[PDB]
């Protein structure tokens, strides 16, 4: 809602992503893969070389991914808050139907002969 803000203040009333979020685990995995590719293109032992470098790949991805996931969750909360409030403001456009049962509704039968 706030102009050119990555995370408006109201976003703090939502629960933050857990640090065991499955989406966050995937992002951390992508950082691990990036670390491996870095060793491979530079012709270093892929698994062993530069564990300090590999750690920072995992850490940076998880750090950025945590905030992206938080904004992602925030934008979907905002979408629903907007959508439900609009429905409340315009009842005549979203009228509750009278729900007929299947014993009353006539559906045509199409034999598979």
């Amino acid at each position: 809602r706030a102009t050119f803000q990555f995370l408006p203040d109201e976003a703090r009333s939502l629960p933050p992503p857990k640090l065991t979020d499955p989406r966050l685990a995937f992002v951390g995995f992508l950082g691990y893969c990036s670390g491996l590719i870095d060793n491979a293109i530079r012709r270093r032992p892929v698994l062993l070389a530069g564990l300090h470098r590999q750690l920072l790949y995992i850490t940076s991805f998880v750090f950025v991914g945590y905030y992206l996931l938080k904004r992602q969750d925030y934008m979907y909360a905002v979408r629903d808050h907007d959508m439900f409030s609009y429905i409340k403001s315009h009842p005549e456009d979203f009228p509750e139907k009278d729900k007929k049962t299947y014993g009353e509704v006539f559906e045509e039968f199409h034999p598979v002969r």
């Binding site: 729900k99 007929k100 049962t101 299947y102 014993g103 559906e107 039968f109 034999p111 598979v112």
Partner: protein
């Protein structure tokens, strides 16, 4: 005994007593006595041993009872939670009705073998019962297709009910 004689009926047995009109010995009589001595007795004792072990470890299993739930006629349109239960119930009844037709078919075939050359006249009740049940099964389930559902079954019934109403109106 083992099954229910009501569900699988067998007419009472009538065996003619032997009336040998020949002096010769009957080969079947002695082979029967040999079969009982050489096969039946040893096989019978081996079974009685097994039936002793089972009696020392008696445990039970049960036939599942399915409570009745509202059928698809009582379900609101697109209410999956009520549709799901009615749909599953209808599917269970579809399988049971299939086995009902199998039971009636089994009676029909058992009668045809039992009566021999007289089956044409002595299996009229079985044939009639089979004819009626196949008519009922056909009306319920025939021509629904591979993707059958309680909804398609209901739509087929309503169409049938409409046709019967209109003919009755012509009367």
């Amino acid at each position: 005994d083992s099954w229910d004689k009501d569900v699988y009926p067998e007419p009472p047995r009538r065996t003619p007593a032997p009336s040998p009109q020949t002096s010769l010995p009957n080969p079947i009589t002695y082979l029967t006595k040999a079969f009982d001595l050489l096969v039946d007795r040893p096989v019978t004792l081996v079974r009685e041993f097994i039936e002793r072990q089972h009696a020392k470890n008696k445990y039970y299993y049960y036939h599942r009872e399915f409570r009745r739930v509202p059928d698809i006629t009582e379900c609101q349109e697109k209410d999956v939670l009520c549709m799901f239960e009615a749909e599953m119930q209808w599917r269970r009844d579809y399988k049971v009705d299939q086995e009902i037709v199998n039971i009636i078919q089994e009676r029909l075939k058992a009668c045809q073998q039992r009566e021999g050359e007289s089956h044409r006249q002595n299996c009229a009740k079985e044939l009639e019962q089979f004819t009626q049940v196949v008519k009922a099964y056909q009306d319920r389930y025939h021509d629904l297709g591979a993707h059958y559902s309680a909804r398609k079954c209901l739509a087929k019934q309503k169409q049938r009910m409409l046709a019967e109403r209109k003919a009755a109106k012509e009367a």
